[PDB]
Design a protein that fits this description.
Layout (H helix, E strand, L loop, with lengths): L12 E7 L7 H4 L4 H20 L6 E4 L3 E3 L9 E8 L8 H11 L5 E2 L2 E2 L6 E4 L5
Antiparallel strand pairs: 1-4, 1-7, 2-4, 3-4, 5-6
PDB class: structural genomics, unknown function
Keywords: structural genomics, SEA domain, mucin 16, RIKEN Structural Genomics/Proteomics Initiative, rsgi, unknown function
Assembly: monomeric
Length: 132
């Protein structure tokens, strides 16, 4: 057997996160078998797509992966966007702040994402695969 395997992976995955104040955490958002969930799930993922091609990193950045939504504490009138700033195999020189600033520039300092008003301080991007 053995058809490869020699210490290879290529491509990188970035953890995209940013709560959207313009999205209440209802029961629908809790169950993937709802409309409010699928709709918002594709709505945000769709907005991020057109945002990338327009962003400064519209060459190495492939697309995003909306994992799910989280319910922030204190107030239940928000929704934590659990996305994944996925990149291409060619992308080698990519920092965390890079996608963070590129997204804030288009979202007006992280306030209005196309058609979804979201906070800025809440937003944050990190590295997914890092042994943890």
């Amino acid at each position: 057997g053995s058809s490869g395997s020699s210490g290879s992976s290529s491509s990188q995955h970035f953890n995209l996160n940013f709560t959207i104040t313009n999205l209440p955490y209802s029961q629908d958002i809790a169950q993937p078998s709802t409309t409010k969930y699928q709709q918002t799930k594709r709505s945000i993922e769709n907005a991020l797509n057109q945002l990338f091609r327009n962003s400064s990193i519209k060459s190495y950045f492939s697309d995003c992966q909306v994992l799910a939504f989280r319910s922030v504490s204190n107030n239940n009138n928000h929704t934590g966007v659990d996305s994944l700033c996925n990149f291409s195999p060619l992308a080698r020189r990519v920092d965390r702040v890079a996608i963070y600033e590129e997204f804030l520039r288009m979202t007006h300092n992280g306030t209005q994402l196309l058609n979804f008003t979201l906070d800025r301080k809440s937003v944050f991007v990190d590295s997914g695969p890092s042994s943890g």
